[PDB]
């Protein structure tokens with residue numbers, strides 16, 4: 001049974017790597033909560049943009065907050081074929097207090113180097129009682 005909901009705002013990314021022949025990249029972000037079988041969330045694609053701003057908000061059913069971890073994956077949408085990874089990071093749900101607007105800045109890495117940019121996110125945890 002779920003014990004709370006976390007509110008994730010994907011704010012912006014800064015300093016992404018060029019991944020297209022021209023235009024930079026077409027970034028979007030995939031957000032997955034660990035220990036879960038729900039479809040991951042994806043932001044809008046920000047075509048031809050190496051400093052995209054989304055300010056996009058998602059929410060996730062928390063089952064246990066010291067265990068579960070948020071996975072943020074930044075991909076470059078392709079006109080042909082599948083999007084190509086641009087970097088990822090994780091963020092632990094133990095890193096917050098309920099009812100407080102907490103921001104973070106995650107560095108993008110190949111897996112959990114060459115500066116791959118930053119992803120700014122905000123989290124707000126709210127439990128039931």
Ligand SMILES: [Ca+2]
Pocket residue numbers: 019020021076077078084
């Ligand atoms: Ca590309």
Ligand SMILES: [Ca+2]
Pocket residue numbers: 019020025026076077078079
């Ligand atoms: Ca692309």
Ligand SMILES: [Cl-]
Pocket residue numbers: 044045046047
């Ligand atoms: Cl679009």
Ligand SMILES: [Zn+2]
Pocket residue numbers: 045047
């Ligand atoms: Zn589009």
